[PDB]
Design a protein around this nucleic acid. Sequence first.
DNA 1: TTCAACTGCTTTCGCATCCCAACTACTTTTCCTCACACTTGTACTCCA
Length: 158
Amino acid sequence: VEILDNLSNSSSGLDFLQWMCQIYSSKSRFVQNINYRSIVPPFQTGSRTHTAKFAITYLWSSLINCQKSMLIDKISEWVLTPPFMEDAEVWFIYASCHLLKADTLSRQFVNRDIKINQVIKHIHYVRTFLKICLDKGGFAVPSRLIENQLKSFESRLY
DNA sequence: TTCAACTGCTTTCGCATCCCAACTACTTTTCCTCACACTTGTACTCCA
């Protein structure tokens, strides 16, 4: 919080969470037998079947940071690369990155054969990443309320 | 008097199970720093 809420010559905290998720990337299994001294899982380590909290804070705070910069392609290219096949929160973020492109591009700037179908691609990415998010374990989304927003992107498109 | 397998031959130079390692633990190597129980007088009166 100190780098982001300093704002003077700041890295805004996002290059430091990038530092955390580079050198503490460890897909190793949690051996669950040794007594643990000076480490604890739920806030500072990142084993297999547990995404690290600095990893998902790097995903939330770079989606929100990219929204406020209006580069979403570059986060959507990164989230593509790690298919965390053990959790639903990364897939909700990956579904929500495409919802933001499907939100931004659904203004149409007229009152176009390529402007149409690209939004349909992002709408179909949301409906298929939210489905695989909901098939996983516990991450309860307002899955009705998001469908009201995807249809609203298409009614503006028609 | 014939059928059917065993048969060597196509060119001409030069190209072309055992080991290791990871990280985190627990442990040993010792050396340094003090206390805890014991005891005789002395002190303050004790009873003669």
